[PDB]
Amino acid sequence: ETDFPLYNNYTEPTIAPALIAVAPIAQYLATAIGKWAAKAAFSKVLSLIFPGSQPATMEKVRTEVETLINQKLSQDRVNILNAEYRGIIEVSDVFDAYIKQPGFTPATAKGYFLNLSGAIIQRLPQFEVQTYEGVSIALFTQMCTLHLTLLKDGILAGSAWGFTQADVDSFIKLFNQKVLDYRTRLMRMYTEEFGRLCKVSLKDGLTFRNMCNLYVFPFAEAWSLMRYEGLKLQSSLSLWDYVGVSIPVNYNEWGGLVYKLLMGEVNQRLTTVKFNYSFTNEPADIPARENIRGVHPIYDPSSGLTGWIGNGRTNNFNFADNNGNEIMEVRTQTFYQNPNIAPRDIINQILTAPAPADLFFKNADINVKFTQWFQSTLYGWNIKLGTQTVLSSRTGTIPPNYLAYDGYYIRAISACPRGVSLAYNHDLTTLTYNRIEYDSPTTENIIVGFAPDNTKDFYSKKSHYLSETNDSYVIPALQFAEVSDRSFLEDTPDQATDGSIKFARTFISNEAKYSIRLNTGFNTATRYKLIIRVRVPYRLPAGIRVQSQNSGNNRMLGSFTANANPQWVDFVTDAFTFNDLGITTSSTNALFSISSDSLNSGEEWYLSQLFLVKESAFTTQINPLLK
Amino acid sequence: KDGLTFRNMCNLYVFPFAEAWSLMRYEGLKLQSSLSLWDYVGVSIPVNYNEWGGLVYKLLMGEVNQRLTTVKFNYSFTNEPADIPARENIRGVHPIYDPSSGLTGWIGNGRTNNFNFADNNGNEIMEVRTQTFYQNPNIAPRDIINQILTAPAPADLFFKNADINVKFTQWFQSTLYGWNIKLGTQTVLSSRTGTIPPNYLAYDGYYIRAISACPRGVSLAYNHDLTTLTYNRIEYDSPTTENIIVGFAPDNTKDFYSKKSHYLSETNDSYVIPALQFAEVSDRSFLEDTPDQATDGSIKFARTFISNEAKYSIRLNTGFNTATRYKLIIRVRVPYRLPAGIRVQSQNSGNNRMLGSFTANANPQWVDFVTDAFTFNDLGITTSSTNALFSISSDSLNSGEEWYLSQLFLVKESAFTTQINPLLK
Amino acid sequence: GNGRTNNFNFADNNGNEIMEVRTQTFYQNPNIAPRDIINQILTAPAPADLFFKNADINVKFTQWFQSTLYGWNIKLGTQTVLSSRTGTIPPNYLAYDGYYIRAI
């Protein structure tokens, strides 16, 4: 309807991810996870969520979310939410003001604390109305963040706020319960809305997921990291731009095929991308048209795991790779003659685009133009990756569509199979060995994945480099060196990572290795600890084992008993030094291994991430075993 | 075909004796041959020696540590213009070993039509028959069939014999073909071009382990450096093959391809383990044809990242003494020096124990490394251990470097003695 | 219209004119139904009395996602030229007392 430029499918430019309304909240949250300032963090959180006792920041958050997900709220609902905001604001102001008086009465502080916690618990369900959950899931996320913070301060400042030891233990129990209940409710709302939107179109589900990756899931990871003091809050989720027609995708089909095709080789850099382009202007009575028949991303050139998503065929002569040379383009030109000329072209070609000299694309300009003709939809495409014009439209000028995000870079380019059943090869599409491809006559869509800049070192050096200055390191499970067979990719966005590893191998063993390197100036005498995040639904009689392997100098770091638990659990090893592992500034084959024995039919266990933190900077503040 | 016949002869009259020579300096090891005999039925195809150990042998072996579970043929029959006699073509062979890996692919082609419809609608296309009728005033229906024949492994997991044969026919300096295929007791294909005499492919003391083909009419000089043991796709496109190759393995290897592990007994005094009978192998590994080792090959490690590792699964039978002392012998060829050396390790449910570390010096010949004595109680392995593993490992290499592993020897300390020193040259 | 039956450009060579082409397709789903594609030439000569007197030609329509499918029934005099493979189609007696079929 308009020929104006687009910005990530939107009519006006979008807000940078570091400039959103929830950014200072997340920044101080990470600062506090690093080092928690007792009996003082709740005031800062309250000043950042309700600045000057005003709900204006929450209205800004609501407006930004409404703009992103294309869902507005009725004025009555807005009035109800503001009423609840002011109700919380009154009690919060009372409690925050009473504490800053030097020499206050602790019993009155205890009363105010109880009133505030009760008021928050009471007004929480107002944001969980599913009819509007898609919009309120962000607003909900902040509220629990205001509450989970409070309780923690209450657990730390005990007799200072008039709490007895039984009060502290009851608060610890309440925290250990709420940190799981809030996550369960948040994930309930997320999965409901995501499945509902994907059943309509994949693009809308991807947009909702991109919104939750910024306003929701980092805070859930922060919740999961609040019981400690010293770990690093870091998000490695990717933003997915979808350009093309609408395709309905089931939720069983998302985490069974579509996400796997979107990720490809999860620990490899994109090196080549190939498109199957088709143009035809047969009978001039019908306008020109263009088709995208298939996308082929190539990461590791010597592995051959990823295959055609769509089809790479250009003709029916069964000649596409013989005579040594692969076919590239076929153009057929037809000439007619009427006594009372107009050559017709039919082109089927393979467009190739390699990775630039700096190994990564930063932006893109992909767009599609629709046309109606006797209740029939014709397409035209425009493709440009970085500075290389891959395809200009032969059907007329098409407005641009700048796909870019400040602080992100293009990591993957894939598509979605259109017009075929997406219910097959679920149990076959593993991480390795098996072929990652799906046949379909056309796709008519392109999906681009932007990864944050903090993951740019791994996809360039294939290893995790350690520095002396940093105090905490987070390693996602997908950034490995090699993984065993019968392993799957599980979408766990609540972990603030691009996924987790599901081991389900009934032979040999299940193992995952990670490459570690040391920078010049790294102290090898400093003591460190390892933290492993795993979910063990079925009992493992051999347990999980964390081992250090360095040029045959294998050393056992930890062995943990695996008991059945339908939730995430953290295992903490004993302290160690890098001189005990025999790793120096010249070690190039250092490896950390997480291993377990073979499983039984129907069993599997999940691995999310790893935390490496100095012994001095790590302390457990809230015990998890006291339920 | 003639090269394969010569190789089958040397596998019986030559190479076992060379292995015996290589094992004469000791006293206690086991002389055992695991070479396979290859029956080739079809037309003649010239193959270079660089192309044999670079593509053809790799396509003939397939998954070297997996049992054959399915075999699919692409059959074509046509009697177009009755002036020309009937003819039959073998357009492609597809062997399927591990159903959940997907490593092996079509050798030839699995296409049946040009409508690009072979896997849509949920169901894979199986057969296409076109029947043509004519009319002359002065009837004879013509058939054109393109189908996919499927044959799974029998109830006893292995075929013992076969009856594959081909019949040639000349017609105006043009060669027409007819085929007959039977695997075990299952008639896969009877010839529609007339009766063809049988051709009993069988060997007393051997069983069918692999069924493959050779690409005909295409250059065999590509994808040499890509066709590895794992990860990469093991396939080669060609319009026709017109040949079938069957590999018979000796009966002594029947336990491994059925139990996927090496079972140990108390009665035997020596055990030999070929390198190809592993549980898992690292990437960037290749198959090297070393028939002088009396095995179906050796492993070439050439990985410039992480590490090069090969693991073997070991199980113990009831009545095995765990207090008896044993030794390990590793046969390797190390052309380029390895500063980290080779390492033999024992991994049993996290009870990892280091068995040996050997300095790797450059040597263009085969060398044996002997570990110190050990007992199975030191490794923590019992009659119930199901995840016992022996690992041979080395660090990453440089560009152009590689090292070879042939076999392993497990013999009791009492029954092993070095009689002729190899270091005294 | 057109008398073509295939795209192999083979309709009158080898002395004999092509009459019928039937292609049968077989599929396989692990979780059979042969498909037929027939293109043929139906021939009907004039009867012994040189003229047809009546006929029974009819067509049946079917709707499927705003797409019209057809089925036909053809009978000239007493010779059944074509019975419908898409289901039974009611008759349509084309005849006039005092007239005879002259052109088709």
Numbering used by the authors:
A (entry chain A): 14 to 353, 357 to 643
B (entry chain A): 216 to 353, 357 to 643
C (entry chain A): 323 to 353, 357 to 429
Task: Give the exact sentences the study uses for this entry.
Cry11Aa and Cry11Ba are the two most potent toxins produced by mosquitocidal Bacillus thuringiensis subsp. israelensis and jegathesan, respectively. Cyt1Aa, Cry11Aa, and co-crystallized Cry4Aa and Cry4Ba. These are produced during sporulation and are remarkably stable in a variety of conditions, but dissolve after ingestion under the high alkaline pH levels characteristic of the larval mosquito midgut. Solubilized protoxins are activated by insect gut proteases enabling binding to gut cell membranes, subsequent oligomerization, and ultimately gut cell lysis leading to larval death. Cry11Aa and Cry11Ba structures maintain the three-domain organization characteristic of Cry δ-endotoxins.
We then focused on Cry11Aa E583, a residue sitting at the intramolecular interface between domain I and domain III. This β21 residue, condemned to be anionic at higher pH, takes part in the water-mediated hydrogen bond network that connects α6 and α7 from domain I with domain III. We asked whether or not suppression of the pH sensitivity of the network would stabilize the monomer at high pH, thereby increasing the tolerance of crystals to pH elevation. This was indeed the case, with an SP50 (pH at which 50% of crystals are dissolved) of 12.6 ± 1.0 for crystals of the E583Q mutant, compared to 11.2 ± 1.0 for WT Cry11Aa crystals. The dissolution profile was also altered, showing a reduced slope and no visible plateau up to pH 14. Thus, the alteration of the protonation state of residues and water molecules at the intramolecular interface between domain I and domain III may be involved in the early step of Cry11Aa crystal dissolution. To evaluate the significance of these changes, we characterized the distribution in size of crystals of Cry11Aa-WT, Y449F, F17Y and E583Q using AFM. All three mutants had a significantly reduced volume compared to WT Cry11Aa, due to a reduced thickness of the crystals. The structures of the other three mutants were determined, using the WT structure as a molecular replacement model for the phasing of diffraction data. We found that neither overall packing, tertiary structure nor interface formation is affected in the tested mutants at neutral pH.
